[PDB]
Amino acid sequence: EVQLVQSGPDVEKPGASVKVSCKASGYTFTSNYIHWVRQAPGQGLEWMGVINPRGGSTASAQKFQGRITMTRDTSTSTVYMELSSLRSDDTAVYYCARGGRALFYDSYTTPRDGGSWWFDPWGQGSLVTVSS
Amino acid sequence: MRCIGISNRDFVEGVSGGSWVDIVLEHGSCVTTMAKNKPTLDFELIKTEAKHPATLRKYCVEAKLTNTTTASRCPTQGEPSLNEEQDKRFVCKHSMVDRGWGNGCGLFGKGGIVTCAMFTCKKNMEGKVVQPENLEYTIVITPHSGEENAVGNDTGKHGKEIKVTPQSSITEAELTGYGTVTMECSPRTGLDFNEMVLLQMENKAWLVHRQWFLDLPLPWLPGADTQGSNWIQKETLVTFKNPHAKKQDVVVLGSQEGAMHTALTGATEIQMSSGNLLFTGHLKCRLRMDKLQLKGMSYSMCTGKFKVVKEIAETQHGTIVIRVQYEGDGSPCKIPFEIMDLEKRHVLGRLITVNPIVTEKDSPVNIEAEPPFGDSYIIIGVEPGQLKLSWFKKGSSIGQMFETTMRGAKRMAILGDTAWDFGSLGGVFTSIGKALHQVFGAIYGAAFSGVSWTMKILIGVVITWIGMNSRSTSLSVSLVLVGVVTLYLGVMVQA
Amino acid sequence: LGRLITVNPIVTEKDSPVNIEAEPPFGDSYIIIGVEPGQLKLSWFKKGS
Amino acid sequence: DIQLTQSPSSLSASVGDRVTFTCQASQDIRKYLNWYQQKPGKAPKLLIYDASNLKTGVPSRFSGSGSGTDFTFTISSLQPEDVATYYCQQFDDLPITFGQGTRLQIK
Amino acid sequence: SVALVPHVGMGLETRTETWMSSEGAWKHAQRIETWILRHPGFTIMAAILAYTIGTTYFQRVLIFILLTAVTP
Ligand SMILES: *[C@@H]1O[C@H](CO)[C@@H](O[C@@H]2O[C@H](CO)[C@@H](O)[C@H](O)[C@H]2NC(C)=O)[C@H](O)[C@H]1NC(C)=O
Ligand SMILES: *[C@@H]1O[C@H](CO)[C@@H](O)[C@H](O)[C@H]1NC(C)=O
């Protein structure tokens, strides 16, 4: 079925870097876009960035500029998010999910758009804590 | 209203065609139009808003360096290497110095040497583009005829905002009473976007055509960014010292921001704060007026006894607005406004209120008109003649045609052959004009484009000279055309 | 004058984004799908020569 | 940029009641908007797309409305299992952004 | 750098003034003339060249004003 299994929660020291994994199933792993959305406990949802399984194109939000890398393994049908220079503010839960769209490479706004970005087929989230 | 005082304005007489008219209007300008009937309307053009941009380019005007290791092999074998040369986020250079027993090592020769530096930029330019979509014009089309307070104050609600987008058309507009009006834009004939770039600096922005904005030097970086810090270029940035022999050095280049201003001169700027402010540009609408009442019909002519407030108010040439306040009973009755010669009625003005009207009574209704070149006797009074005002319009006639020709010249410049369209329905001659100048000036004005004040005027005088010494009567095709296009277009442009 | 290549475009079952292709002249073009209240006119310009 | 305002921040209501939310956009977002329900400790979930549309498998008491900058989510009859926090989502332009959320409290 | 290619002739202009607005021209002239005042000799030699080559009087005038333009 449509499914996402993220790796389990982790804790790191400040200034560090953490790698969270997103595995998927139930479709063609190259047929949907991936995005990462974070939620701090005392806050709502925040959009971190995007990776395209097909071909590897990527993009990220201004806030995380410089701080976050996204990669994939097609063979495993899995995406990797990584954050650098970890700081206490970074402590939150992270989420990954998909999009139906057209492809080669990852943006779009005019084509199709929307369709439960991360509300029906969203991972289970994972907790990460930046602490000393 | 809302036109008066802006100068630079566009009187369009008559319509015919059964319907339509061709109006070319921009920004700082505005347009006043008339027909043998229908109320005089004014087209004033305000902010143009392009909604969705998309971001192509990252130029940085300033950076800094750190870390910055360097190496040399010794002065034959090998060309030195350093691992951080790997990550293109560094900048690298090879140079050559020398080494020997002083340096201590080998061979006594002129050595290879390298360096690298970490590169990071705080300040940017956001430059984006907009497709000939998601972009819209907003127009106020204001009626004349009284209703106090300003020939002016574009703020305040009369002519609505009549927004328009290429995604739509036909521009259906309504005003109180007569106010059914049909306009049709041709925005795709507008600024010719996809040639365009909107460039946001720290606040101020600038609209410049694409290629130049591609070729511009300084550090490159593509719209994707996303941590990339991937900047191409940097050779034109961050210069390296190499004093006489030993070592070498790397230098942050220093902010060019001002110099960038000096570059972006020769370009209209644009303010952009929220989503767009875009000003300037121009557009062409065609106007079908069918659909218009005169704003009142079958009345009685006033009664009598008007009392004036204020005086004459000659602006530009003509319009001479007057403000008056009716006193009496008769309720919204027509105002018998006339403009006449000495005595002996020859009577000639021309009146633009057309069909002025009293409102609810007390309210300072106002008028505008065009007296002849000379003496003018103006009369609003009827039963006891109640009023006459002496006026004199200086200037004349010949001078009028002359200055007019100057305006049409400027309009042949600035705006191009859309200018030829700015009249209405000249049948053949107008169309064939638009085409002749279309491809003609298309070849000639451009191609010998990209040139400035100096070189323009100068090339002008030289080619008109070589024309003056030409043979075979072709001098005219030199010469008159030459000097005209060259000189006249010389001083008018570059504003 | 255009020239239309859907030739004989057609509505399907109703709701479905039907599409069309055509060839406007070298110049200005005014495209109209609308009939009874004239509906939609769209301004177009084809550049070229 | 595409500032999305969500109102109100929270509501308490009795079962069976009709409840509505409103999201207001700093720019015209046309028909791109979304409505999430999320129960605590659960991933968020789908409710409304294109601001107008139920998903299959979603109960019918849900609805959504609004067009240019303004929108309203509605549950016809409050039901206890609906206790959650709800959201609206601007997709337009792709500086992807969410509404702050609205919590419910059953009466 | 951006110091030159100052987006001038280009096109598109408009009815409204743009930026340096009746300066940068006046600027261009004043600076180059200034530099002429500073280096008179080069003017001299150049002019001489004008009297040497072509010289077809109008020619002299031309190549002279160019050799004035020639300083970067
Ligand atoms: C431009 O229009 C505004 C809007 O009508 C004028 O402001 C009005 O002035 C009258 C004069 O008594 C007031 O009764 C209205 O309440 C004003 N409108 C407001 C405050 O919204 C303004 O006066 C006009 N410009 C000039 C120069 O008169
Ligand atoms: C540069 O040096 C600083 C300390 O001097 C260090 O923290 C940083 O990691 C270095 N950067 C690189 C790219 O080596």
Side-chain angles (χ1 to χ4, degrees), chain A residues 1-103 108-116 118-121 123-132, chain B residues 1-9 11-12 14-21 23-25 27-33 35-41 43 45-48 50-61 63-72 74-78 80-83 86 88-95 97-132 134-135 137-147 149-153 155-160 162-171 173 175-182 185-191 193-194 196-201 203-214 216-224 226-234 236-248 250-268 270-289 291 293-310 312-313 315-326 328 330-337 339-340 342 344-359 361 363-367 369 371-374 376-382 384-402 404-416 418-420 422-495, chain C residues 1-12 14 16-20 22 24-27 29-35 37-49, chain D, chain E residues 1-12 14-16 18-22 24-32 34-72:
Chain A
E1 295 180 350
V2 163
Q3 187 177 355
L4 291 171
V5 176
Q6 296 177 338
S7 59
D10 287 341
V11 175
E12 295 303 321
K13 298 297 180 66
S17 62
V18 62
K19 182 179 296 297
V20 178
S21 66
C22 184
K23 186 179 174 63
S25 64
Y27 67 100
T28 296
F29 176 80
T30 65
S31 295
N32 290 284
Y33 291 88
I34 304 304
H35 302 274
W36 292 98
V37 173
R38 64 176 298 174
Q39 188 174 358
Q43 190 178 355
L45 306 180
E46 183 182 3
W47 181 88
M48 294 180 71
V50 51
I51 184 171
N52 179 336
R54 179 181 296 175
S57 65
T58 60
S60 173
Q62 295 301 321
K63 291 185 179 299
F64 299 94
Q65 182 61 48
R67 299 181 64 251
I68 175 170
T69 299
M70 295 176 180
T71 59
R72 76 183 182 284
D73 179 354
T74 300
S75 65
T76 59
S77 298
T78 303
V79 177
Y80 296 141
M81 176 181 71
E82 179 178 359
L83 180 61
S84 63
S85 297
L86 298 174
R87 65 184 67 88
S88 63
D89 293 345
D90 300 340
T91 292
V93 178
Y94 296 143
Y95 294 85
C96 55
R98 292 202 297 271
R101 298 195 298 270
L103 288 74
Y108 298 129
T109 170
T110 306
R112 292 299 176 184
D113 118 315
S116 170
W118 49 74
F119 228 164
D120 220 21
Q124 76 290 3
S126 180
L127 174 60
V128 176
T129 300
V130 176
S131 176
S132 61
Chain B
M1 310 297 187
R2 283 186 175 87
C3 287
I4 303 298
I6 204 68
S7 297
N8 60 40
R9 177 195 63 194
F11 287 162
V12 175
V15 49
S16 299
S19 298
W20 63 92
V21 178
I23 299 96
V24 177
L25 57 86
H27 189 271
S29 65
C30 55
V31 177
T32 297
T33 58
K36 292 185 68 65
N37 286 282
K38 292 175 293 299
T40 63
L41 293 176
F43 296 166
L45 179 60
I46 60 172
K47 62 182 179 181
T48 299
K51 289 188 175 75
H52 293 169
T55 172
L56 166 62
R57 283 177 76 96
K58 290 188 181 301
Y59 290 147
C60 55
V61 185
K64 64 181 178 181
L65 301 174
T66 185
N67 300 127
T68 306
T69 59
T70 179
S72 75
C74 173
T76 59
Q77 71 181 21
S81 175
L82 190 149
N83 53 29
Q86 186 69 72
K88 194 184 295 178
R89 187 176 67 259
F90 294 94
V91 64
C92 304
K93 179 178 289 296
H94 302 290
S95 297
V97 290
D98 54 348
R99 284 178 59 84
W101 284 101
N103 287 277
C105 51
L107 188 144
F108 275 150
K110 178 175 77 177
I113 184 169
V114 301
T115 187
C116 302
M118 188 179 79
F119 181 85
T120 302
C121 300
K122 299 294 180 290
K123 276 162 63 177
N124 302 131
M125 289 192 289
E126 291 172 346
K128 302 172 180 176
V129 297
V130 291
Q131 298 170 333
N134 284 341
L135 65 91
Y137 301 96
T138 302
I139 300 172
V140 293
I141 57 110
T142 186
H144 291 90
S145 67
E147 182 65 15
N149 77 350
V151 301
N153 72 340
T155 60
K157 293 177 179 178
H158 300 79
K160 304 299 184 180
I162 188 63
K163 64 179 177 297
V164 65
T165 184
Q167 186 175 356
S168 63
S169 295
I170 79 170
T171 309
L175 302 175
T176 302
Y178 48 90
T180 300
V181 168
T182 56
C185 300
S186 64
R188 298 184 181 281
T189 60
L191 297 176
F193 293 86
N194 298 338
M196 292 295 188
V197 178
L198 272 64
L199 178 57
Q200 290 77 359
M201 189 65 180
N203 52 30
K204 293 185 174 75
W206 291 269
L207 183 145
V208 291
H209 71 76
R210 185 177 184 172
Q211 293 179 339
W212 176 94
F213 183 71
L214 291 172
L216 192 144
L218 299 181
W220 177 272
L221 194 147
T226 299
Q227 177 167 351
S229 175
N230 195 31
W231 296 84
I232 301 174
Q233 288 307 324
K234 303 170 187 178
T236 60
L237 196 135
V238 62
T239 305
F240 296 168
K241 290 196 295 290
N242 187 342
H244 47 82
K246 60 183 179 296
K247 299 301 279 190
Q248 64 176 12
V250 302
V251 176
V252 291
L253 184 58
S255 295
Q256 295 77 358
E257 174 183 1
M260 181 66 179
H261 297 167
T262 303
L264 56 76
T265 191
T268 180
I270 180 58
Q271 191 178 358
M272 181 162 173
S273 176
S274 177
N276 185 347
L277 293 179
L278 180 62
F279 285 160
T280 69
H282 70 288
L283 60 82
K284 183 180 69 64
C285 293
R286 179 170 175 169
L287 176 61
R288 296 182 184 175
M289 290 180 181
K291 292 190 286 187
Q293 295 301 321
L294 289 173
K295 188 178 176 60
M297 285 297 290
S298 179
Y299 285 87
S300 65
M301 297 176 180
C302 179
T303 57
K305 186 180 173 62
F306 293 99
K307 176 183 75 179
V308 297
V309 290
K310 292 183 179 297
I312 46 176
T315 311
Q316 295 90 7
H317 294 76
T319 58
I320 56 107
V321 306
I322 308 300
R323 182 181 295 177
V324 301
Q325 183 67 258
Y326 169 75
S331 177
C333 290
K334 292 164 59 184
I335 298 167
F337 181 91
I339 287 173
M340 299 175 176
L342 282 70
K344 55 181 293 181
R345 306 296 184 272
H346 192 198
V347 49
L348 296 175
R350 61 178 63 88
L351 165 59
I352 325 303
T353 305
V354 176
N355 192 341
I357 184 168
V358 176
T359 313
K361 189 181 176 178
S363 66
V365 63
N366 56 346
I367 291 172
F373 60 84
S376 175
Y377 292 87
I378 189 170
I379 174 169
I380 56 97
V382 285
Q386 185 65 260
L387 190 146
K388 289 163 57 178
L389 294 173
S390 295
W391 175 253
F392 173 80
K393 182 176 182 178
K394 181 59 174 169
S396 69
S397 61
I398 302 301
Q400 295 297 101
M401 180 176 284
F402 176 83
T404 301
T405 302
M406 296 298 293
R407 300 177 65 250
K410 184 181 172 64
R411 287 186 294 108
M412 291 178 71
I414 303 174
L415 292 173
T418 61
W420 288 99
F422 173 76
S424 176
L425 42 83
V428 177
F429 295 158
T430 295
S431 177
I432 195 66
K434 186 182 70 63
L436 183 143
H437 197 283
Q438 180 63 61
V439 64
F440 178 84
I443 288 173
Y444 289 140
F448 172 70
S449 64
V451 293
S452 64
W453 184 88
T454 62
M455 300 299 105
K456 188 175 295 297
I457 181 170
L458 185 143
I459 188 173
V461 298
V462 62
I463 180 168
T464 190
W465 180 260
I466 192 68
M468 183 171 175
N469 289 337
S470 174
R471 295 183 181 177
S472 297
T473 303
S474 178
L475 53 85
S476 294
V477 178
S478 179
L479 187 66
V480 291
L481 184 143
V482 166
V484 169
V485 61
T486 55
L487 295 177
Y488 174 75
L489 191 143
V491 294
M492 291 295 104
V493 297
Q494 187 61 60
Chain C
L1 296 175
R3 61 178 65 90
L4 165 59
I5 325 303
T6 305
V7 176
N8 192 341
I10 184 168
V11 176
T12 313
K14 189 181 176 178
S16 66
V18 63
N19 56 346
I20 291 172
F26 60 84
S29 176
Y30 293 87
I31 189 170
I32 174 169
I33 56 97
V35 285
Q39 296 307 315
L40 297 175
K41 289 163 57 178
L42 294 173
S43 295
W44 175 253
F45 173 80
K46 182 176 182 178
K47 177 68 170 173
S49 294
Chain D
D1 309 47
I2 303 268
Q3 290 305 319
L4 173 56
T5 60
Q6 183 171 353
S7 294
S9 296
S10 63
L11 287 174
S12 298
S14 297
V15 176
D17 299 345
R18 182 182 298 276
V19 63
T20 59
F21 296 157
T22 301
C23 291
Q24 183 176 354
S26 62
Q27 297 303 321
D28 182 4
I29 62 174
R30 59 178 64 88
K31 290 176 180 176
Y32 298 133
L33 184 64
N34 301 132
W35 291 103
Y36 290 98
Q37 66 176 19
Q38 186 177 1
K39 297 177 178 180
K42 270 69 179 180
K45 191 182 179 183
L46 162 57
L47 291 177
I48 303 302
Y49 65 94
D50 296 341
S52 64
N53 289 280
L54 297 174
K55 177 62 172 173
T56 60
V58 175
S60 178
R61 62 180 178 274
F62 301 93
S63 64
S65 296
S67 295
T69 57
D70 293 344
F71 297 92
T72 297
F73 175 76
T74 301
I75 291 170
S76 63
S77 62
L78 178 59
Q79 301 181 341
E81 70 287 12
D82 296 342
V83 57
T85 302
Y86 295 82
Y87 294 87
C88 51
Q89 184 180 1
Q90 299 177 339
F91 178 75
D92 188 5
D93 295 309
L94 289 145
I96 294 175
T97 307
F98 299 101
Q100 188 173 355
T102 301
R103 293 182 296 100
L104 268 63
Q105 296 177 335
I106 302 170
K107 293 176 179 175
Chain E
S1 67
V2 294
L4 285 76
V5 192
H7 185 68
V8 282
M10 303 304 175
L12 284 61
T14 186
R15 181 61 57 86
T16 66
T18 58
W19 186 256
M20 292 299 290
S21 298
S22 65
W26 182 257
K27 177 185 297 297
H28 188 64
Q30 287 180 335
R31 69 178 179 88
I32 63 99
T34 298
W35 179 89
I36 294 170
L37 182 143
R38 295 297 180 189
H39 303 169
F42 174 71
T43 295
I44 301 301
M45 183 67 73
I48 294 171
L49 300 175
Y51 178 77
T52 61
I53 182 66
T55 62
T56 160
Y57 61 99
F58 178 80
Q59 189 66 60
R60 292 179 185 172
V61 175
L62 180 66
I63 53 178
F64 179 82
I65 195 66
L66 273 68
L67 291 174
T68 62
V70 298
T71 183

mmCIF file of all heavy atoms in Angstrom, chain B residues 1 18 63 68 140 178-179 198 292 312 382 409 418 444, unseen atoms left out:
data_model
loop_
_atom_site.group_PDB
_atom_site.id
_atom_site.type_symbol
_atom_site.label_atom_id
_atom_site.label_comp_id
_atom_site.label_asym_id
_atom_site.label_seq_id
_atom_site.Cartn_x
_atom_site.Cartn_y
_atom_site.Cartn_z
ATOM 1 N N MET B 1 -12.068 64.886 -14.966
ATOM 2 C CA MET B 1 -11.068 65.174 -13.951
ATOM 3 C C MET B 1 -9.817 64.332 -14.143
ATOM 4 O O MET B 1 -9.580 63.722 -15.189
ATOM 5 C CB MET B 1 -11.605 64.883 -12.547
ATOM 6 C CG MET B 1 -12.957 65.467 -12.179
ATOM 7 S SD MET B 1 -13.140 67.249 -12.148
ATOM 8 C CE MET B 1 -14.774 67.406 -11.460
ATOM 9 N N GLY B 18 -18.392 53.878 -36.421
ATOM 10 C CA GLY B 18 -19.549 53.367 -35.736
ATOM 11 C C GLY B 18 -19.298 53.020 -34.290
ATOM 12 O O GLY B 18 -20.233 52.599 -33.604
ATOM 13 N N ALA B 63 31.330 39.451 -0.510
ATOM 14 C CA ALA B 63 31.682 38.161 0.045
ATOM 15 C C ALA B 63 32.741 38.348 1.114
ATOM 16 O O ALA B 63 33.033 39.468 1.531
ATOM 17 C CB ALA B 63 32.198 37.218 -1.041
ATOM 18 N N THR B 68 41.613 29.150 3.670
ATOM 19 C CA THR B 68 42.470 29.584 2.578
ATOM 20 C C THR B 68 43.882 29.049 2.721
ATOM 21 O O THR B 68 44.827 29.772 3.046
ATOM 22 C CB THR B 68 42.474 31.108 2.519
ATOM 23 O OG1 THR B 68 41.121 31.566 2.433
ATOM 24 C CG2 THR B 68 43.232 31.599 1.312
ATOM 25 N N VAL B 140 -8.132 53.768 -14.168
ATOM 26 C CA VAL B 140 -9.235 54.623 -13.771
ATOM 27 C C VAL B 140 -9.705 55.357 -15.013
ATOM 28 O O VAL B 140 -8.908 55.999 -15.707
ATOM 29 C CB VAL B 140 -8.821 55.592 -12.651
ATOM 30 C CG1 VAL B 140 -8.525 54.812 -11.397
ATOM 31 C CG2 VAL B 140 -7.591 56.379 -13.046
ATOM 32 N N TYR B 178 -24.774 56.440 -17.879
ATOM 33 C CA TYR B 178 -24.233 56.136 -19.194
ATOM 34 C C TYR B 178 -23.116 55.108 -19.207
ATOM 35 O O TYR B 178 -22.724 54.626 -20.275
ATOM 36 C CB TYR B 178 -23.696 57.437 -19.748
ATOM 37 C CG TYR B 178 -22.834 58.120 -18.719
ATOM 38 C CD1 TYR B 178 -21.479 57.887 -18.649
ATOM 39 C CD2 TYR B 178 -23.397 58.970 -17.784
ATOM 40 C CE1 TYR B 178 -20.705 58.505 -17.696
ATOM 41 C CE2 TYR B 178 -22.641 59.572 -16.832
ATOM 42 C CZ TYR B 178 -21.298 59.353 -16.793
ATOM 43 O OH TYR B 178 -20.542 59.981 -15.833
ATOM 44 N N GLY B 179 -22.622 54.756 -18.038
ATOM 45 C CA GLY B 179 -21.248 54.346 -17.849
ATOM 46 C C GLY B 179 -20.903 53.002 -18.466
ATOM 47 O O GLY B 179 -19.820 52.470 -18.226
ATOM 48 N N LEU B 198 13.099 41.393 -13.823
ATOM 49 C CA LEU B 198 12.874 42.226 -12.652
ATOM 50 C C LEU B 198 13.953 41.925 -11.631
ATOM 51 O O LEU B 198 14.111 40.774 -11.226
ATOM 52 C CB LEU B 198 11.507 41.951 -12.041
ATOM 53 C CG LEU B 198 10.328 42.745 -12.569
ATOM 54 C CD1 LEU B 198 10.079 42.437 -14.021
ATOM 55 C CD2 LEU B 198 9.121 42.396 -11.735
ATOM 56 N N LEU B 292 -23.298 54.454 -24.642
ATOM 57 C CA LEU B 292 -23.047 55.585 -23.756
ATOM 58 C C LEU B 292 -24.191 56.576 -23.851
ATOM 59 O O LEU B 292 -24.547 57.023 -24.943
ATOM 60 C CB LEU B 292 -21.749 56.324 -24.086
ATOM 61 N N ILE B 312 -10.143 81.339 -13.720
ATOM 62 C CA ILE B 312 -9.904 81.109 -15.138
ATOM 63 C C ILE B 312 -9.216 79.773 -15.372
ATOM 64 O O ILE B 312 -9.739 78.910 -16.082
ATOM 65 C CB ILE B 312 -9.125 82.288 -15.733
ATOM 66 C CG1 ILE B 312 -7.956 82.649 -14.816
ATOM 67 C CG2 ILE B 312 -10.058 83.453 -15.947
ATOM 68 C CD1 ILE B 312 -7.053 83.741 -15.332
ATOM 69 N N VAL B 382 -28.037 83.842 -19.026
ATOM 70 C CA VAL B 382 -29.137 83.802 -19.982
ATOM 71 C C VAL B 382 -30.156 84.924 -19.821
ATOM 72 O O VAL B 382 -30.098 85.925 -20.540
ATOM 73 C CB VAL B 382 -29.824 82.427 -19.926
ATOM 74 C CG1 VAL B 382 -28.955 81.423 -20.604
ATOM 75 C CG2 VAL B 382 -30.033 81.987 -18.482
ATOM 76 N N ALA B 409 5.954 63.998 -32.764
ATOM 77 C CA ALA B 409 7.316 63.546 -32.981
ATOM 78 C C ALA B 409 7.789 62.706 -31.810
ATOM 79 O O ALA B 409 8.227 61.566 -31.985
ATOM 80 C CB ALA B 409 8.232 64.747 -33.196
ATOM 81 N N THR B 418 3.214 51.509 -32.608
ATOM 82 C CA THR B 418 2.017 51.625 -31.794
ATOM 83 C C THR B 418 1.557 53.073 -31.758
ATOM 84 O O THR B 418 0.357 53.358 -31.747
ATOM 85 C CB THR B 418 2.336 51.131 -30.393
ATOM 86 O OG1 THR B 418 3.371 51.954 -29.840
ATOM 87 C CG2 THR B 418 2.848 49.709 -30.460
ATOM 88 N N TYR B 444 15.945 49.755 -39.185
ATOM 89 C CA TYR B 444 16.849 50.895 -39.203
ATOM 90 C C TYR B 444 17.100 51.453 -37.808
ATOM 91 O O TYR B 444 18.256 51.567 -37.398
ATOM 92 C CB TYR B 444 16.315 51.952 -40.165
ATOM 93 C CG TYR B 444 16.434 51.512 -41.609
ATOM 94 C CD1 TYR B 444 15.429 51.778 -42.528
ATOM 95 C CD2 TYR B 444 17.563 50.834 -42.055
ATOM 96 C CE1 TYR B 444 15.548 51.380 -43.853
ATOM 97 C CE2 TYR B 444 17.688 50.431 -43.375
ATOM 98 C CZ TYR B 444 16.679 50.708 -44.272
ATOM 99 O OH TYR B 444 16.793 50.309 -45.586
#
